[PDB]
Design a protein around this ligand. Structure first.
Ligand code: HEM
Length: 186
């Protein structure tokens, strides 16, 4: 996982569950409890798993609920740390640029495997967005969508159309419906 992003997760976990839980979880994988992950670093997916496993153990929450909560809260973290991605945008625009943003932010990484997040309009008031990744981070994806709606103060309903693995990739397709019309024919 890209280092910059794992860094946001550590801060988000502190915001959700407190410094004791995070410090102890980080120690349990042999990190300094105050470690600062730099943009010159990546973190092995399995270390992240082990950290989150420890958070689940300590909080008594299922790890899927943790990812869902982290996904919701991490939008706030992103908006504070990387404000340029939110500046002067609405929710639909933000969601539709995510696929490209994830390519752009992992370009420089050898063997990069960003999630794909292709969105396409399917109605005046709806888009379809499909999460595709080897990583199976469904609750995180859903949480980020929920957090995005909160941050942009734009009400949406999220219909989970299909979820499952295909050709080695996990895939989750959702239909996101906006309370008020967002597109027009042109
Ligand atoms: C400013 C906002 C955001 C930034 C800067 C950002 C950036 C990133 C980066 C760099 C990664 C690491 C990918 C890798 O190492 O392969 C990542 C992971 C991920 N991103 Fe974002 N992201 C943002 C918002 C979102 C949103 C809105 C969604 C979904 C709607 C999303 C979905 C995901 C998911 C599900 C992962 C986990 C990796 C995986 O499942 O393969 N992100 N993000």
């Amino acid at each position: 996982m890209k280092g910059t992003i794992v860094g946001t997760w550590i801060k988000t976990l502190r915001d959700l569950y407190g410094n004791d839980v995070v410090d102890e979880s980080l120690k349990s994988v042999g990190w300094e409890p105050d470690r600062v992950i730099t943009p010159l670093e990546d973190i092995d997916d399995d270390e992240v798993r082990r950290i989150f496993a420890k958070v689940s153990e300590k909080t008594g929450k299922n790890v899927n609920e943790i990812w869902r909560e982290v996904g919701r809260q991490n939008i706030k973290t992103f908006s504070e740390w990387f404000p340029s991605y939110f500046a002067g945008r609405r929710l639909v625009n933000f969601l539709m640029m995510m696929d490209e943003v994830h390519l752009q932010l992992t370009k420089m990484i050898k063997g990069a495997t960003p999630p794909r997040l292709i969105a396409k309009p399917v109605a005046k008031d709806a888009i379809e967005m499909e999460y595709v990744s080897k990583r199976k981070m469904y609750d995180y994806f859903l949480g980020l969508i929920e957090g995005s709606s909160k941050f942009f103060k734009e009400e949406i309903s999220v219909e989970e159309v299909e979820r499952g693995e295909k050709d080695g990739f996990s895939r989750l397709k959702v239909r996101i419906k906006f309370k008020n019309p967002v597109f027009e024919y042109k």
